[PDB]
Amino acid sequence: STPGAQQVLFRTGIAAVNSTNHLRVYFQDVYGSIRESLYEGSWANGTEKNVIGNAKLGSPVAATSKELKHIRVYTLTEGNTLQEFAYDSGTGWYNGGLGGAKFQVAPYSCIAAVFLAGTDALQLRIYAQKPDNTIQEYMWNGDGWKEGTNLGGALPGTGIGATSFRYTDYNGPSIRIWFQTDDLKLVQRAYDPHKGWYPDLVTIFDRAPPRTAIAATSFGAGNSSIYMRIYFVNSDNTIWQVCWDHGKGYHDKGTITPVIQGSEVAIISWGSFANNGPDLRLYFQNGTYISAVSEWVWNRAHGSQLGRSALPPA
Numbered sequence: 001s002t003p004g005a006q007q008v009l010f011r012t013g014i015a016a017v018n019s020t021n022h023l024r025v026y027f028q029d030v031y032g033s034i035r036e037s038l039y040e041g042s043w044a045n046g047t048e049k050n051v052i053g054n055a056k057l058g059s060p061v062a063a064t065s066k067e068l069k070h071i072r073v074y075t076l077t078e079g080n081t082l083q084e085f086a087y088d089s090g091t092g093w094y095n096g097g098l099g100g101a102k103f104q105v106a107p108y109s110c111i112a113a114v115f116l117a118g119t120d121a122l123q124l125r126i127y128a129q130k131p132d133n134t135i136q137e138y139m140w141n142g143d144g145w146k147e148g149t150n151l152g153g154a155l156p157g158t159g160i161g162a163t164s165f166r167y168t169d170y171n172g173p174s175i176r177i178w179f180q181t182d183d184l185k186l187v188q189r190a191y192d193p194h195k196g197w198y199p200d201l202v203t204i205f206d207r208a209p210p211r212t213a214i215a216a217t218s219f220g221a222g223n224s225s226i227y228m229r230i231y232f233v234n235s236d237n238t239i240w241q242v243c244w245d246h247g248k249g250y251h252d253k254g255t256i257t258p259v260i261q262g263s264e265v266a267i268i269s270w271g272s273f274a275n276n277g278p279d280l281r282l283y284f285q286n287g288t289y290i291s292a293v294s295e296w297v298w299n300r301a302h303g304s305q306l307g308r309s310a311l312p313p314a
Ligand SMILES: OC[C@@H]1O[C@@H](O)[C@@H](O)[C@H](O)[C@@H]1O
Pocket: 021, 022, 039, 281, 295, 297, 307, 308
């Protein structure tokens, strides 16, 4: 290993945000602190000086952004309440207002978070699992945190993936979320502006490991068209990808890359098929220096490739 890699919690929560190829990756260190590594032409940071806050050991870690002007990172306190580490350009890092509400969730809850796409002002939807094992939406619409729509029951401790995009022929944002139900299937729920939440679950995978990591992204929004990619850790100790492509639907799935048993997963994307993209980046643990976080890359030039073998601080 390396001294730096040793500071990374084994099976750490992982989150990532980006403005095109300007990247931030969040993880938890062995002391419970949440740290930020970054890519700005090269990889840096992830050290004890790059701590944005503290969370319970083993906490989920979720993050979302508006470019890199506004970043929000969500974790659980020791008290199993949702908290928010917030960054705005010109202000820096601070404790976000979500913590004031002190929302208790299940101790084993995961978290997903999105800024809603294409809206006039900043709007956030956070998803977590309550002690009754239902998936609850929490909203920020500019005037305090409030519970939004309850999305019903899921496997206790389920992974939660989420994405928001705006169809260019609609006047409001769409949301897709993915999680695991008691039957061990992975499923999607969906919000569109003209329908609200659709009543049905859409199966994306028949049987997944219990509490497997789930991470999602979307890109290339157009007129009634979108592209999406969902990632999870399968029973073969590899990340699998499920593809939604416009005109083909959920048409393919397969292995991507090996991971450690019980690795967490994060995904970011940028660009689109129309402009020599997309670019995809996955972050996970595959045993590099034992506990380092590694990267997988997809791009138009070279397709599927391992990227940075060990993120900072490794
Ligand atoms: O533009 C983003 C960068 O793309 C490739 O160069 C990767 O090797 C690198 O780790 C980073 O993801």
